[PDB]
Structure formats: C-alpha cells, structure tokens
C-alpha cells in the first residue's frame, strides 16, 4: 500500500493547490455563490477527510 | 532525511521555506493590480 500512500499524498497536494487558487476568488467575489460556496466548502471537507484518511494510511 | 515514504516529495519541501517572502512581495503585486489607489 506504499504506492497507494504516495498516490494519496499526491492527490492531497493536488487538492490543496486547487483550494489555494480557488479560495481567494470564491471568498472575495460572492457573485457565483450558488455553486462557488458548495465548491469551496466541499473542497474544505474533502481536504479534512483526506488528511484524516492519510493519518491512518501512514501506518 | 525524509521518511522513506515521503522521500518522493523531497523537491517540493525544497521551496517551502522561502514562500513567506513571496507573500510580502505579493502585497505590492496586489497594490500593482489596483494601481496604488
């Protein structure tokens, strides 16, 4: 599962960078809030879940 | 040395420490966008 673990962390980095770009634009301009708010909060939730999963997937 | 699981991500960490400086520089870029109003 080591390769699985590396792929998981790579996906974590990908998601984290995506959130990095998206969050200022979503938060600053609430013009597209209907889908933007869902996008940003779902990205945060996926970030938390992925971190928690990797926590165990380390061991 | 990184944990042998994380060693693949060695290059990324190599650019982490200098990231805060960019933030400061970023400010002027922000003040560049609004044209220093």
């Amino acid at each position: 599962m080591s390769v699985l673990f590396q792929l998981l962390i790579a996906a974590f980095v990908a998601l984290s960078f995506a959130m990095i770009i998206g969050v200022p634009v979503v938060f600053s301009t609430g013009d597209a809030s209907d889908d933007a708010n869902k996008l940003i909060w779902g990205g945060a939730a996926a970030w938390v879940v992925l971190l928690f999963v990797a926590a165990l997937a380390s061991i | 040395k990184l944990p042998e699981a994380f060693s693949v991500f060695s290059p990324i960490v190599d650019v982490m420490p200098v990231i805060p400086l960019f933030f400061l520089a970023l400010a002027f870029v922000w003040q560049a966008a609004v044209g220093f109003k």
Binding site: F17, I20, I21, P24, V25, S28, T29, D31 | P11, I12, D14, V15, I19, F22, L26, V29, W30, A33
Partner: peptide, 23 residues
C-alpha cells in the same frame, strides 16, 4: 530540477491575483 516547483508557485500567486482582477 527545483526550478519547476518554484516556477509553479510563481505562477500560482499572480494567477490568484488575476482571477480576482478579471472581476
């Protein structure tokens, strides 16, 4: 070697600026 990630971050910053700058 390491200029790739540094360039990636250099793209990341001003892009975040620009996406707001469009609106």
């Amino acid at each position: 070697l390491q200029l790739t990630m540094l360039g990636a971050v250099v793209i990341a910053g001003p892009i975040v600026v620009l996406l707001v700058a469009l609106r």
